């Protein structure tokens, strides 16, 4: 369950202050797709990264 | 044991920049995000920002856009801080600190630079 | 930006007490991380994630908190204890710190 209020509308470094199970549960892999170009100018952790990786193989 | 190592004190004129450092060892640099902060003598704290060492992606506390820049050399191990123009209102002390694993705040901190600007 | 307010701003304390320190925020946090710091030190990370013990420290530090109000406890106070604790939120970029309730030991 996303937290209410927390659904990512945009892949952007406000992201960077979600714990790895709050990417998981906020962040639509549609949305992701989308703004994938994004996402390599976030400072990401390897841990978020992984997760993010991981909702782009869900497609 | 995980140490950040900052650089010593600075004195600087109204107008220079100033560039700081931090050099990290016992773990492994691009594992984890590095912070900076800043606390005016007596005074609260205030993030200025951080960055990711391995991409070099970073993000930035509006209100310090300008006036600092983050950057790194990965092969030293070693997270750096820029600050430009400097007035009175930068004089104070800037810590690094290292963001824990999964957003578990700052796990270690450095010692703290003091940077007085003067004339 | 989330503004914290933390109070009471100083609190002093009979060694042995039972006491609690409030950081309000302005709007909805997730998590909040609390640090230690004592005249001439780096800040410490004390609790972290809201509720859980950082390494190191003693099992009479806890933390709870929902949504706005969030408080660090100090279940029996000892003389090392005086220090000034921080919160800190991990919610909203970006990151902001309340400005600290100072712990003073009665004696």
């Known amino acids: 369950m996303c937290p209410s209020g927390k659904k990512a509308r945009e892949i952007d470094e406000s992201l960077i202050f979600y714990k790895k199970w709050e990417l998981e549960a906020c962040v639509d892999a549609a949305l992701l797709a989308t703004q994938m170009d994004r996402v390599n100018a976030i400072p990401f952790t390897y841990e978020q990264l992984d997760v993010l990786k991981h909702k782009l193989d869900e497609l | 044991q995980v140490q950040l190592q900052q650089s010593g004190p600075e004195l600087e004129k109204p107008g220079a920049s100033v560039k700081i450092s931090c050099k990290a060892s016992?773990?492994?640099?691009?594992?984890?995000?590095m912070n900076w902060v800043k606390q005016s003598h007596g005074k609260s704290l205030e993030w200025i920002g951080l960055?990711?060492?391995?991409?070099?992606?970073?993000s930035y506390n509006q209100k310090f856009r300008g006036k600092a820049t983050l950057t790194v050399d990965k092969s030293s191990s070693t997270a750096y801080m820029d600050l430009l123009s400097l007035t009175s209102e930068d004089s104070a002390v800037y810590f690094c600190?290292?963001?824990?694993?999964?957003?578990?705040?700052?796990?270690?901190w450095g010692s703290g630079t003091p940077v007085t600007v003067s004339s | 930006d989330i503004e914290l307010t933390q109070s009471p701003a100083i609190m002093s304390a009979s060694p042995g007490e039972k006491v609690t320190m409030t950081c309000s925020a302005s709007?909805?946090?997730?998590?909040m991380h609390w640090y230690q710091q004592k005249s001439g030190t780096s800040p410490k990370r004390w609790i972290y994630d809201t509720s859980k013990l950082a390494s190191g420290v003693p099992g009479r530090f806890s933390g709870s908190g929902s949504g706005n109000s969030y408080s660090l406890t100090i279940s029996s106070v000892e003389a090392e204890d005086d220090a000034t604790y921080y919160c800190?939120?991990?919610?909203?970029?970006?990151?902001?710190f309340g400005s600290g309730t100072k712990v003073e030991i009665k004696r």
């Open positions: 600190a290292r963001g824990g694993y999964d957003g578990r705040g700052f796990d270690y």
């Open positions: 016992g773990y492994s640099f691009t594992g984890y995000t």
């Open positions: 960055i990711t060492p391995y991409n070099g992606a970073s």
């Open positions: 709007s909805s946090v997730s998590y």
């Open positions: 800190q939120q991990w919610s909203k970029h970006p990151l902001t």
